Amino acid sequence: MDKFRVYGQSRLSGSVNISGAKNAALPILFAAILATEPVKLTNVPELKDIETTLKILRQLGVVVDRDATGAVLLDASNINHFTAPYELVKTMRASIWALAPLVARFHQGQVSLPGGCSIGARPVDLHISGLEKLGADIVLEEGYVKAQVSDRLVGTRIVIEKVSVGATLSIMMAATLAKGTTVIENAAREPEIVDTADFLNKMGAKITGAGSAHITIEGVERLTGCEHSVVPDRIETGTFLIAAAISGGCVVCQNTKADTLDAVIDKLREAGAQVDVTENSITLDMLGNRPKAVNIRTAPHPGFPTDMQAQFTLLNMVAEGTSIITETIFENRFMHIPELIRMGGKAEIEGNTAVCHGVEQLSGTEVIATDLRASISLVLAGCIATGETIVDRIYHIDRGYEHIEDKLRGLGAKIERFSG
Amino acid sequence: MDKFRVYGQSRLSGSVNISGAKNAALPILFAAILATEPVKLTNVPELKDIETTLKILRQLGVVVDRDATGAVLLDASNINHFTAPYELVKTMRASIWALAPLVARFHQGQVSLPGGCSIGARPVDLHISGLEKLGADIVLEEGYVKAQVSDRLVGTRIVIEKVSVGATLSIMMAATLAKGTTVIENAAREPEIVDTADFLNKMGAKITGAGSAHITIEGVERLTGCEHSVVPDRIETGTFLIAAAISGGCVVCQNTKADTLDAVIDKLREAGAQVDVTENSITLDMLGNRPKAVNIRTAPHPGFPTDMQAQFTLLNMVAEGTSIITETIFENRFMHIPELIRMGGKAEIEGNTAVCHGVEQLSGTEVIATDLRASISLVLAGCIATGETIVDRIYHIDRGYEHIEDKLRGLGAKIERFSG
Numbered sequence A, B: 001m002d003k004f005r006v007y008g009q010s011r012l013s014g015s016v017n018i019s020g021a022k023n024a025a026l027p028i029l030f031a032a033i034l035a036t037e038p039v040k041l042t043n044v045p046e047l048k049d050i051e052t053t054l055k056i057l058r059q060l061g062v063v064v065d066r067d068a069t070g071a072v073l074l075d076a077s078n079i080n081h082f083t084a085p086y087e088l089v090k091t092m093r094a095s096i097w098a099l100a101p102l103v104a105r106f107h108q109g110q111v112s113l114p115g116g117c118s119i120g121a122r123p124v125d126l127h128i129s130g131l132e133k134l135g136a137d138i139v140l141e142e143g144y145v146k147a148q149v150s151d152r153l154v155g156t157r158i159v160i161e162k163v164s165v166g167a168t169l170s171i172m173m174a175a176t177l178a179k180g181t182t183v184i185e186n187a188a189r190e191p192e193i194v195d196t197a198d199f200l201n202k203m204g205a206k207i208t209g210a211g212s213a214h215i216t217i218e219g220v221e222r223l224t225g226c227e228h229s230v231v232p233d234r235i236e237t238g239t240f241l242i243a244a245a246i247s248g249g250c251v252v253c254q255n256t257k258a259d260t261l262d263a264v265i266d267k268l269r270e271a272g273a274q275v276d277v278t279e280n281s282i283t284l285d286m287l288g289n290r291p292k293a294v295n296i297r298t299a300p301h302p303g304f305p306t307d308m309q310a311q312f313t314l315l316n317m318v319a320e321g322t323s324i325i326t327e328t329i330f331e332n333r334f335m336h337i338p339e340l341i342r343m344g345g346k347a348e349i350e351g352n353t354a355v356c357h358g359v360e361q362l363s364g365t366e367v368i369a370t371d372l373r374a375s376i377s378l379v380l381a382g383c384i385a386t387g388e389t390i391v392d393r394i395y396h397i398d399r400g401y402e403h404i405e406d407k408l409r410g411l412g413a414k415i416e417r418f419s420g
Ligand SMILES: CC(=O)N[C@H]1[C@@H](OP(=O)(O)OP(=O)(O)OC[C@H]2O[C@@H](n3ccc(=O)[nH]c3=O)[C@H](O)[C@@H]2O)O[C@H](CO)[C@@H](O)[C@@H]1O
Pocket: A023, A026, A094, A120, A121, A122, A123, A124, A125, A126, A127, A128, A163, A164, A165, A166, A167, A168, A188, A306, A307, A329, A330
């Protein structure tokens, strides 16, 4: 049980390299189950979830490994097992993405149903439903979702009840090998879905409209293989931009894709920051200024990302003025607020809305990481708080932030990873 | 990391002894900080939270121990330390109750602010506010709530913004030694508050209206000591009644206080059960019948208790018909639903409402305990599911259920506690 010791009162400035997106690499890795020929992935961050995914794949018969260059080589030519075991799946709800490819290509698959989650309900009803529409027969027995289709899946129009990144990806994946044309209406538009779509296309798939609420897929016999560089992580990028915005510093994020963070960049500018976007980098200069409070309302892409909500709660807590933060995606994603309040922040919670009252300076103390995005927010808070800050259950960060210690340290942060 | 192995397909019938209420023993234990003379508590369940509380007390200078009879002897005559340390408080948010007594009697106290919680936000703003109204000066520094009053607290009328069991108890405790008369309006009416009130009265306090939304307290110089038998646990009682109702069995709960479960008992009867209440026992005979789905709406006492919500979600999932369960107290208290769905249950979640569709039989599998009331619900589900069920993170039950293994086993359950 590791925990970070962070020394406060610091200005975070400098350069930081942005890695590939966890939420792109994950679905792409499961989508590789459809590949009949070799696959090579680059810009894949080293994260716990990637490792767990690899284990699930190997367990299905997929041969995969990361080489000395960091690239991930994957061969799914001889998959002979069709069950994503509970032992592994219980540690990563994203593995639900194993079901779609397996049924589509092998006409059978098994993945254990999701468990309870601290930030909110995470059912997969839309995933199951979408697959059934495509012709899959699904039975729920022994905690497993068991799909089976006596023949190749059948394209059709599916109108997803609500905007779901997960279900959009599952259905898109299965559609690739279905007979006929599939239309995914009211689809999520997230950049990770576009990237997964492009990945699939490189292997023969025929997907159009990815990134819009209207995705069209013309099923094909089978997918081949390819080499693909994972899309830069917009959330990691947004996080480091926040590092500068909350500390008066100036940070330059390298290897970015600015057009995936319009909502974030505009809120940062609204907060009083200057950000310049080039095709491969994004710079944020807070100008040694305290930020101005701004209202936040999370929403499906291209709106403000829920995955940046905790980071902006921190920005508003040190900003000048009152702010209204409305979380519309999940129902319990404010667990970071009490921890931040322990550090001197001020927020009043009511329903899915937090009304924050910015203060000039936070104070270091002990806090507990409750989730992925909250964990980084607490570390960042520790960087600008007076004195020392200790963050427990820091294992959460390793789920979405590659070498976060070195990267932050590279921006002037003084942080030591110790074991309690 | 222990976990329960439960063998399903069983009818739970028999007798079970009900212990004292965790939510009465806890506040009473912290209230004992006001005692200048010896205190003797009986019917105090052996729970992790009680142990942690004892540690906090000893750390303040209180001499306390449980003897061979099970009674808890406590001497708070020489308290010489006034800080409930974060090291301990971080493991039990209820320790916030240490602040009120300490400030009231010693005119100073320190307790660390609460952290994030999985079932919902658990701020203590109403606690702090109530104490300030009484004249306490409070500062938040280094993650601690530091109270101080240059003189004896001062009675006044306090209108709590919302119904809070915790804040009602904190203010009531401090009011006992304030100068003048204090009125707590819009107070929570829970049975545990009444019991704590009676406890305080036995030591000289002057509290009236406990159990109603209007509590009147006439401050006094100091409190003495006494012997007190903790009120029976209505939630534990409700839980075992559910054991019979979901399995077609017949259970008799001994050493009860039926008038604290009217809402629960009436819903059980609505579900098709026969329950007979005597002054010291409550019997539920399901009559070998499958229950009828009933709607649930949690609310402050005397309405349906949120602490029985998970238990009734299980009842409705095996019942006949559709049910609407509305949780109005906390915002993420449905983490048990996905786990139960893994077992065959069916529920659709939307906001603070779960629409369940009862099924005839659940199926055994692996599930994870997410919280206290959810953990027991999963164990109970395992008792009536076909085959075998394994419940992980079972350490949650030990927070509110004394010797739960023996008690359930005493009702016909086959359960083995093993270490993964
Ligand atoms: C591995 C990954 O990519 N995770 C991201 C993904 O998660 P995730 O896959 O859960 O995102 P979704 O957009 O699909 O769903 C979000 C909401 O839809 C609900 N829902 C989803 C599926 C379903 O079948 N039924 C249903 O009711 C969820 O309960 C939740 O309220 O999108 C979230 C919103 O951008 C991000 O914060 C996550 O980091």
